[PDB]
Design a protein around this motif. Structure first.
Motif, PDB file in Angstrom:
ATOM      1  N   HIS A  42      29.556  10.057 -63.661  1.00  0.00           N
ATOM      2  CA  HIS A  42      29.940   9.634 -62.617  1.00  0.00           C
ATOM      3  C   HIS A  42      31.672   9.734 -62.404  1.00  0.00           C
ATOM      4  CE1 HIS A  42      30.941   5.044 -64.132  1.00  0.00           C
ATOM      5  NE2 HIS A  42      31.483   6.240 -64.855  1.00  0.00           N
ATOM      6  N   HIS A  44      35.456   8.064 -60.920  1.00  0.00           N
ATOM      7  CA  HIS A  44      36.379   7.046 -60.165  1.00  0.00           C
ATOM      8  C   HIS A  44      37.609   7.345 -60.225  1.00  0.00           C
ATOM      9  CE1 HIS A  44      36.095   5.758 -64.285  1.00  0.00           C
ATOM     10  NE2 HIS A  44      34.738   5.547 -64.132  1.00  0.00           N
ATOM     11  N   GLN A  48      39.957   5.750 -67.485  1.00  0.00           N
ATOM     12  CA  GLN A  48      39.257   5.193 -68.323  1.00  0.00           C
ATOM     13  C   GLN A  48      39.261   5.601 -69.921  1.00  0.00           C
ATOM     14  OE1 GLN A  48      34.276   5.182 -69.309  1.00  0.00           O
ATOM     15  NE2 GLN A  48      34.971   4.687 -67.152  1.00  0.00           N
ATOM     16  N   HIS A  83      32.492  12.076 -65.974  1.00  0.00           N
ATOM     17  CA  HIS A  83      32.134  11.847 -67.411  1.00  0.00           C
ATOM     18  C   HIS A  83      30.727  10.775 -67.303  1.00  0.00           C
ATOM     19  CE1 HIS A  83      34.377   8.305 -65.782  1.00  0.00           C
ATOM     20  NE2 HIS A  83      33.657   7.215 -66.488  1.00  0.00           N
TER      21      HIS A  83
HETATM   22 FE   LIG Z   1      33.151   5.497 -65.923  1.00  0.00          FE
END
Ligand SMILES: [Fe+2]
Ligand SMILES: O=C(O)C(=O)Cc1ccc(O)cc1
Length: 210
Positions: A42, A44, A48, A83
């Motif tokens: 996914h 976003h 992260q 990722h």
């Molecule tokens: Fe993630």
């Protein structure tokens, strides 16, 4: 509370359970990924980072596959970088992630590894690494040790893996065990004390931007 946030339990899909903690503009989560799980890639807008605490994980990022070792490797997925993950073991993977909309220049590495160092404030041995928007420090707090009062310029999130640690932030005090975190915003006074008879493994994450 702000300094000792209560997590919200979420089930993301049949493979992923999270304890989600809000730390102002950073989300910290503890993760449990099911045995043999495949996690679809996914993306976003939040950047992260994260680490495996128990088990193993395979990171799928930038058309390569990178193994992640417990208490050693940190995965780094910059904004909107696709990722995904596979749990290569028939045991659950217990880990954590932090997510934040970042302003910093891009990360040079998708996987970083902790290396031996010294903690500035305590002068205790630690293992650490610095990334584009964060620093992660893992260190043993010896039995009886008092973490001296300190006001940091940087936001700090921390937790322990074993035992029980007394943490004071600004005007508030709690005993922490694994499953809980502390959050110390910029400039708050923090101190701590290991009143237990065992050495406590502490992980902290310093957020390098504001
Ligand atoms: Fe993630
Ligand atoms: O929580 C996140 O942002 C993760 O990166 C972990 C993750 C990655 C892929 C999935 O399909 C589900 C969860």
């Amino acid at each position: 509370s702000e300094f000792f946030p209560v997590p919200k339990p979420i089930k993301l899909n049949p493979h992923v359970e999270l304890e989600v903690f809000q730390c102002q503009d950073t989300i910290f989560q503890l993760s449990v990924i099911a045995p043999n799980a495949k996690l679809e890639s996914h993306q976003h807008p939040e950047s992260q980072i994260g680490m495996v605490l128990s088990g193993e994980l395979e990171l799928y990022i930038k058309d390569v596959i990178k193994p992640l070792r417990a208490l050693q490797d940190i995965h780094v997925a910059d904004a909107n970088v696709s990722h995904g993950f596979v749990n290569p073991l028939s045991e659950p993977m217990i880990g954590f992630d932090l997510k934040r909309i970042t302003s910093s220049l891009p990360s040079e590495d998708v996987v970083l590894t902790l290396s031996n160092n010294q903690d500035k404030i305590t002068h205790l041995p630690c293992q650490s690494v610095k990334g584009s928007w964060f620093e992660i420090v893992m260190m043993k707090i010896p039995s009886g040790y008092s973490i001296p009062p300190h006001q940091g310029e940087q936001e700090e999130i921390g937790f322990i893996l074993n035992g029980k640690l007394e943490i004071f932030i600004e005007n508030e005090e709690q005993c922490l065990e694994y499953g809980q975190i502390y959050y110390a915003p910029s400039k708050v006074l923090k101190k701590g004390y290991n009143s237990s008879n065992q050495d406590i493994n502490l992980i902290k994450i310093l957020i390098l931007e504001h």
